[PDB]
């Protein structure tokens, strides 16, 4: 496949990693009696470990000669779950914070003491604003084609140079 990689369910070296990770925890398990808390903890760890290899095998990830999963970010839609889909997710949450935080500064600006409300949050007002950023791509778009997103060039102070 891409870059001469093989899928992880068919990699001979990915399977060896699964065995040696389980063998290491089994040889630690043998020094304890079967009902005790260290034996139940290591038994639960080998279940977590065994479920970690099974998950990847059917995942659809690509392995190398090293036996480790690789990620593809060319833009292929077949490997979307690797970068695109968690990427769109992060953009939604990061742009949500920046939008909401900016709404707050603009709101408390027209006031006697704007600086007072940055060290001591008006929580009822802040709480209201935080959840209005769920539709930010629409709200950031309405202000771009209004004139309320970016200011004019005669409103920004500039260094003597330019």
């Amino acid at each position: 496949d891409i870059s001469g990689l093989t899928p992880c369910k068919e990699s001979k070296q990915f399977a060896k990693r699964e065995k040696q990770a389980l063998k290491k925890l089994q040889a630690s398990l043998k020094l304890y009696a079967d009902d005790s808390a260290p034996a139940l903890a290591i038994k639960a760890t080998m279940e977590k470990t065994k479920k970690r290899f099974d998950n990847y095998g059917k995942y659809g990830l690509l392995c190398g000669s090293d036996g480790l999963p690789h990620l593809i970010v060319s833009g292929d839609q077949r490997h979307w779950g690797e970068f695109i889909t968690p990427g769109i997710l992060f953009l939604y949450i990061a742009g949500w914070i920046g939008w909401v935080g900016r709404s707050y500064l603009i709101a408390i600006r027209d006031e006697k003491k704007p600086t007072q409300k940055e060290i001591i949050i008006d929580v009822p007002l802040a709480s209201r604003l935080l959840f209005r950023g769920f539709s930010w791509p629409v709200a950031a778009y309405r202000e771009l084609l209004n004139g309320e997103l970016v200011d004019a060039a005669a409103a920004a102070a500039a260094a003597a140079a330019a």
Partner: protein, 180 residues
């Protein structure tokens, strides 16, 4: 008669794409002026009216047309029909491409900047009124056939988008799964 009969008699610009380039001072001439957007819409419409009729007239069987110029290559689908014709008929393909290249270059060579409202021509006005039409018709008809050309351009652009989507997404337009 107005061009807006299907959207309520008002200019359909949701997403305000004509107002951009004027909303802010921040990209100086990086979005197209009204004159350039008006020629793009006329040109995309005219290429779509020809291309839909092309894929409709060469489709064999089904509803289809199966009409075929004698001597040209028999090709079933429109998706590969260009590259077969480009390899087999170099002289005919090169003369069509040169004709398109000159006429499309002449469109802008005599007039000013289009991207900026500095063109001095009406958008869509290529010197092809050979029939002498609009010199014999009156102003109500001439303004009317412009809107006729526009909406038929607009129906064909959506058609060409359907024709693209059915081959990239196999269940996209369902009225063509049946129609073939």
């Amino acid at each position: 008669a107005t061009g807006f009969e299907e959207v309520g008699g008002k200019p359909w610009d949701p997403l305000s794409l004509g107002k951009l380039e004027d909303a802010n001072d921040t990209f100086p001439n990086m979005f197209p002026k009204s004159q350039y957007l008006q020629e793009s819409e006329i040109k995309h419409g005219r290429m779509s009216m020809l291309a839909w009729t092309g894929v409709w007239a060469t489709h064999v069987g089904g509803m289809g047309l199966g009409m075929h110029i004698p001597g040209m290559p028999v090709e079933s689908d429109w998706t590969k029909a260009l590259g077969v014709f480009a390899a087999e008929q170099p002289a005919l393909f090169g003369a069509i491409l040169l004709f398109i290249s000159i006429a499309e270059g002449e469109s802008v060579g005599h007039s000013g900047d289009n991207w900026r409202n500095m063109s001095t021509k009406e958008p869509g006005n290529l010197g092809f009124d050979w029939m002498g039409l609009t010199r014999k018709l009156s102003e109500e008809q001439v303004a009317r056939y412009k809107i006729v050309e526009l909406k038929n351009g607009r129906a064909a652009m959506i058609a060409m988008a359907s024709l693209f989507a059915m081959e990239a997404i196999p269940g996209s337009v369902p009225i063509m799964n049946v129609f073939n």
